[PDB]
């Protein structure tokens, strides 16, 4: 009844990262950078706005648990002040929107804690998880879960497409967004899952 | 433990409407028209984009139930084609955002069915329910519930404010939004409730 829709690098496991608490600052393979407000530069370093992948394993200062799936998470850090806009990850899938089908999108959202180069990582920017067809946000969880520093929680987004939906046959998409509505203005995501079932 | 925050005309019961399936086309008392894309004109008639209040009682063609609360619902109709933007209701409250507090916003969302002047009311535009502080959308339910023609479902939006939240002491607000992502491009709301409890 319930079928999984394939997602590339759905757990941010590519690339492999060896050293505890290490990270990349380039867009994770299989994803693109969602950048509607031009907050993230094309060339990134540690302290520019950025996104990438990070290893969360034993030894980590960031959570009271390990990565929800595998070794790694995906993260977005925004250096601009709260209110400046949003940015995140986007992936357009090969699957298309089909009628009489209920879609369930799940992703784990992480509010890491700790301290980085004497800067407190306490606080959280807020998140939004979106399911798309074409350019249209069909359904989204805008920041409904309370996630304390050092923990992950699972966001669930659902959508049912009827035969009259204007966006049938358009490509499905997923966005994972840093809302930049608080500091420390970084957050993590892991274990993106998309399933389908009859409406 | 759980305290209710007062909302004006929270069930759209003002004005009273006598005749089955009758409606107004002016902004409900206590609310304003949320109009970020200028879709709703200042002066409305039956077939312009509009909003107002409507009686849902025995005799109605619109639902297989009566109004969720009282006699009336509040509605938003958008005549522009899907994708043209959004509009709805907004109300700014006297309550302000307070730390260590969990807010729960509930509203019933209705997908009316039937036929109006030979135009089918089947289909739905999509909804978004927002909790605000100041100008900031703290949390929102963007269209997560599947609501068939002729029924209502309750949307629940939650948000927990921490002592570090940038928007503490700003006025709370509520938006009820027609997403204009399908036709027939009208929808109803009723029974707005906002409660608070310790985080
Ligand atoms: Ca992973
Ligand atoms: Ca944090
Ligand atoms: Ca009512
Ligand atoms: Ca309808």
């Amino acid at each position: 009844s319930v079928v999984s829709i394939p997602i590339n690098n759905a757990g941010f496991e590519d690339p492999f990262i060896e050293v505890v608490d290490d990270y990349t600052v380039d867009t994770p393979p299989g994803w693109t950078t969602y950048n509607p407000n031009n907050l993230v530069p094309e060339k990134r370093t540690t302290w520019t706005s950025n996104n990438g992948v990070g290893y969360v394993g034993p030894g980590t200062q960031f959570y009271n648990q390990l990565a929800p799936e595998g070794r790694n998470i995906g993260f977005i850090y925004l250096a601009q002040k709260p209110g400046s806009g949003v940015a995140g990850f986007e992936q357009i899938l090969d699957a298309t929107l089909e009628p009489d089908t209920k879609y369930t999108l799940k992703v784990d959202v992480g509010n890491f804690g700790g301290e980085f180069q004497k800067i407190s990582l306490a606080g959280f920017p807020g998140y939004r998880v979106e399911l798309l067809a074409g350019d249209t946000v069909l359904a989204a969880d805008h920041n409904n879960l309370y996630i304390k520093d050092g923990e992950f929680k699972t966001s669930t987004v659902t959508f049912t497409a009827t035969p009259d939906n204007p966006y049938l046959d358009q490509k499905l998409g997923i966005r994972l967004i840093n809302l930049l509505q608080g500091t420390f203005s970084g957050l993590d995501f892991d274990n993106v899952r998309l399933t389908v079932e009859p409406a």
Side-chain angles (χ1 to χ4, degrees), chain A residues 121-164:
Chain A
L121 310 182
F124 188 65
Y127 74 90
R128 178 162 71 244
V129 174
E130 300 180 343
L131 181 67
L132 315 176
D135 302 319
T136 301
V137 180
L138 301 169
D141 170 8
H142 182 106
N143 205 43
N144 283 276
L145 295 163
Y146 176 44
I147 311 171
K148 303 177 176 60
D149 281 300
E151 75 180 356
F152 283 88
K153 289 202 182 171
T154 299
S155 167
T156 302
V157 170
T158 54
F159 179 76
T160 297
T162 67
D164 283 348

XYZ file of all heavy atoms in Angstrom, chain A residues 121-164:
334
model
N 25.938 28.368 20.493
C 25.033 27.764 19.523
C 23.636 27.575 20.098
O 22.773 26.989 19.435
C 25.601 26.445 19.000
C 27.052 26.543 18.512
C 27.505 25.208 17.966
C 27.202 27.657 17.470
N 23.395 28.072 21.307
C 22.052 28.063 21.871
C 21.115 28.910 21.018
O 21.526 29.871 20.359
C 22.075 28.617 23.296
N 19.835 28.550 21.036
C 18.855 29.228 20.216
C 18.693 28.551 18.867
O 19.420 27.624 18.502
N 17.715 29.042 18.090
C 17.265 28.329 16.900
C 16.637 29.328 15.942
O 15.943 30.249 16.397
C 16.218 27.302 17.344
C 15.783 26.337 16.278
C 16.673 25.418 15.741
C 14.450 26.288 15.878
C 16.254 24.498 14.792
C 14.026 25.380 14.921
C 14.921 24.479 14.387
N 16.835 29.174 14.629
C 16.262 30.128 13.671
C 14.841 29.820 13.235
O 14.228 30.679 12.594
C 17.221 30.015 12.469
C 17.686 28.562 12.529
C 17.810 28.257 14.007
N 14.303 28.664 13.579
C 13.050 28.255 12.964
C 13.269 27.539 11.645
O 14.259 27.751 10.942
N 12.313 26.670 11.301
C 12.396 25.834 10.113
C 11.075 25.855 9.350
O 9.999 26.097 9.910
C 12.730 24.363 10.469
C 11.558 23.623 11.067
C 10.666 22.924 10.256
C 11.327 23.646 12.439
C 9.572 22.274 10.807
C 10.231 22.998 12.999
C 9.360 22.319 12.171
O 8.282 21.684 12.723
N 11.168 25.534 8.062
C 10.002 25.182 7.263
C 10.366 24.017 6.354
O 11.438 24.014 5.743
C 9.493 26.365 6.429
C 8.293 25.999 5.557
C 7.536 27.227 5.075
N 8.284 27.989 4.080
C 8.728 29.238 4.248
N 8.501 29.896 5.385
N 9.406 29.830 3.269
N 9.486 23.023 6.286
C 9.609 21.887 5.384
C 8.472 21.970 4.373
O 7.303 22.081 4.762
C 9.542 20.572 6.181
C 9.520 19.361 5.254
C 10.716 20.498 7.147
N 8.808 21.915 3.084
C 7.834 22.088 2.010
C 7.817 20.887 1.076
O 8.870 20.353 0.713
C 8.177 23.317 1.157
C 8.194 24.621 1.918
C 8.528 25.810 1.039
O 9.064 25.591 -0.076
O 8.239 26.965 1.456
N 6.613 20.505 0.653
C 6.388 19.595 -0.462
C 5.890 20.415 -1.649
O 4.894 21.143 -1.527
C 5.341 18.541 -0.087
C 5.030 17.505 -1.167
C 6.247 16.618 -1.398
C 3.820 16.655 -0.808
N 6.566 20.287 -2.790
C 6.256 21.047 -3.995
C 5.713 20.154 -5.097
O 5.995 18.953 -5.161
C 7.514 21.697 -4.589
C 8.484 22.397 -3.649
C 9.696 22.880 -4.443
C 7.762 23.543 -2.996
N 4.952 20.786 -5.996
C 4.762 20.301 -7.356
C 5.056 21.477 -8.269
O 4.482 22.556 -8.087
C 3.339 19.791 -7.603
N 5.959 21.284 -9.223
C 6.381 22.417 -10.031
C 6.931 23.515 -9.141
O 7.815 23.285 -8.312
N 6.390 24.722 -9.290
C 6.790 25.873 -8.491
C 5.878 26.117 -7.293
O 6.037 27.128 -6.602
C 6.835 27.127 -9.369
C 7.784 26.975 -10.539
O 8.881 26.411 -10.332
O 7.436 27.413 -11.659
N 4.942 25.220 -7.021
C 3.876 25.465 -6.057
C 4.153 24.697 -4.771
O 4.442 23.495 -4.811
C 2.543 25.003 -6.655
O 2.294 25.718 -7.876
C 1.380 25.222 -5.674
N 4.059 25.386 -3.637
C 4.164 24.733 -2.335
C 2.800 24.121 -2.021
O 1.844 24.835 -1.695
C 4.604 25.709 -1.238
C 4.717 24.994 0.116
C 5.937 26.378 -1.604
N 2.705 22.792 -2.144
C 1.428 22.112 -1.927
C 1.053 22.096 -0.451
O -0.120 22.261 -0.100
C 1.519 20.674 -2.429
C 1.872 20.507 -3.901
C 2.195 19.037 -4.212
C 0.719 21.015 -4.751
N 2.028 21.839 0.415
C 1.824 21.699 1.849
C 3.148 21.991 2.526
O 4.209 21.702 1.969
C 1.375 20.276 2.210
N 3.084 22.547 3.731
C 4.322 22.860 4.433
C 4.094 22.890 5.932
O 3.033 23.300 6.414
C 4.916 24.190 3.958
N 5.129 22.487 6.661
C 5.197 22.646 8.109
C 6.095 23.854 8.360
O 7.322 23.757 8.264
C 5.764 21.380 8.750
C 6.094 21.559 10.226
O 5.757 22.616 10.803
O 6.693 20.625 10.812
N 5.487 24.995 8.677
C 6.228 26.205 9.043
C 6.380 26.211 10.559
O 5.534 26.724 11.292
C 5.478 27.437 8.542
C 6.171 28.742 8.808
N 6.797 29.466 7.816
C 6.311 29.468 9.944
C 7.283 30.585 8.327
N 7.002 30.609 9.617
N 7.452 25.577 11.042
C 7.961 25.813 12.401
C 6.993 25.384 13.509
O 6.950 26.003 14.574
C 8.385 27.270 12.585
C 9.418 27.437 13.672
O 10.367 26.653 13.762
N 9.250 28.457 14.499
N 6.260 24.288 13.304
C 5.276 23.893 14.313
C 5.867 23.134 15.498
O 5.250 23.107 16.573
C 4.153 23.068 13.689
C 3.172 23.921 12.932
O 2.247 24.491 13.511
N 3.379 24.034 11.631
N 7.022 22.503 15.335
C 7.617 21.725 16.413
C 8.536 22.599 17.253
O 9.309 23.400 16.720
C 8.446 20.575 15.840
C 7.676 19.501 15.075
C 8.635 18.670 14.228
C 6.919 18.623 16.056
N 8.468 22.412 18.565
C 9.417 23.005 19.500
C 10.587 22.044 19.668
O 10.404 20.912 20.132
C 8.732 23.210 20.846
C 9.623 23.732 21.950
C 10.514 24.771 21.721
C 9.547 23.198 23.230
C 11.321 25.256 22.739
C 10.340 23.673 24.252
C 11.225 24.700 24.001
O 12.005 25.166 25.021
N 11.784 22.487 19.284
C 12.978 21.644 19.285
C 14.018 22.329 20.161
O 14.546 23.388 19.796
C 13.503 21.421 17.860
C 12.345 20.997 16.940
C 14.635 20.397 17.849
C 12.716 20.967 15.468
N 14.307 21.738 21.317
C 15.272 22.315 22.240
C 16.694 22.087 21.742
O 16.959 21.217 20.911
C 15.149 21.662 23.614
C 13.774 21.756 24.252
C 13.771 21.006 25.583
C 12.456 21.155 26.314
N 11.327 20.621 25.510
N 17.619 22.883 22.275
C 19.025 22.711 21.928
C 19.479 21.305 22.295
O 19.203 20.815 23.397
C 19.876 23.739 22.675
C 19.839 25.112 22.022
O 20.235 25.214 20.853
O 19.413 26.095 22.673
N 20.158 20.652 21.358
C 20.660 19.311 21.568
C 19.725 18.193 21.158
O 20.020 17.028 21.448
N 18.605 18.491 20.500
C 17.685 17.428 20.107
C 17.221 17.565 18.659
O 17.362 18.618 18.021
C 16.481 17.303 21.049
C 15.448 18.371 20.895
C 14.272 18.188 21.856
O 14.227 17.175 22.595
O 13.390 19.068 21.881
N 16.677 16.453 18.160
C 15.998 16.359 16.877
C 14.532 16.022 17.117
O 14.190 15.330 18.079
C 16.579 15.208 16.029
C 17.904 15.509 15.389
C 19.088 15.269 16.069
C 17.971 15.999 14.097
C 20.316 15.532 15.474
C 19.192 16.276 13.503
C 20.363 16.041 14.192
N 13.667 16.500 16.222
C 12.285 16.043 16.167
C 11.887 15.832 14.712
O 12.428 16.471 13.811
C 11.327 17.048 16.805
C 11.433 17.119 18.310
C 10.164 17.678 18.901
C 10.256 17.802 20.414
N 9.074 18.552 20.949
N 10.920 14.948 14.490
C 10.485 14.618 13.139
C 9.326 15.518 12.725
O 8.293 15.564 13.405
C 10.050 13.158 13.059
O 11.155 12.320 13.397
C 9.582 12.814 11.649
N 9.509 16.234 11.618
C 8.442 16.986 10.976
C 7.737 16.105 9.955
O 8.382 15.381 9.191
C 9.039 18.199 10.259
O 8.107 18.800 9.374
N 6.404 16.171 9.943
C 5.581 15.427 8.992
C 4.689 16.376 8.203
O 3.916 17.144 8.786
C 4.708 14.382 9.698
O 5.541 13.479 10.432
C 3.923 13.576 8.680
N 4.771 16.294 6.882
C 3.963 17.102 5.977
C 3.153 16.149 5.111
O 3.704 15.199 4.546
C 4.857 18.006 5.110
C 4.051 18.674 4.006
C 5.551 19.035 5.984
N 1.845 16.386 5.018
C 0.984 15.534 4.211
C 0.239 16.353 3.170
O -0.069 17.532 3.378
C -0.042 14.783 5.070
O -0.768 15.727 5.867
C 0.645 13.756 5.966
N -0.062 15.707 2.048
C -0.854 16.356 1.018
C -1.591 15.313 0.195
O -1.010 14.299 -0.202
C 0.011 17.199 0.083
C -0.776 17.860 -1.005
C -1.548 18.970 -0.725
C -0.764 17.356 -2.298
C -2.299 19.575 -1.713
C -1.517 17.962 -3.297
C -2.280 19.073 -3.001
N -2.866 15.576 -0.075
C -3.673 14.710 -0.923
C -4.047 15.464 -2.190
O -4.637 16.549 -2.121
C -4.920 14.246 -0.177
O -4.516 13.458 0.947
C -5.793 13.408 -1.085
N -3.679 14.897 -3.337
C -3.972 15.470 -4.641
C -5.244 14.839 -5.185
O -5.349 13.609 -5.257
C -2.813 15.207 -5.603
N -6.197 15.672 -5.559
C -7.442 15.239 -6.175
C -7.322 15.292 -7.694
O -6.404 15.909 -8.240
C -8.581 16.143 -5.711
O -8.379 17.450 -6.249
C -8.624 16.218 -4.191
N -8.242 14.642 -8.421
C -8.182 14.697 -9.895
C -8.292 16.096 -10.482
O -7.896 16.291 -11.638
C -9.356 13.809 -10.332
C -9.520 12.852 -9.206
C -9.214 13.636 -7.957
N -8.807 17.068 -9.733
C -8.960 18.439 -10.205
C -7.777 19.331 -9.845
O -7.821 20.537 -10.111
C -10.241 19.047 -9.637
C -11.474 18.560 -10.353
O -11.320 17.928 -11.422
O -12.594 18.806 -9.849
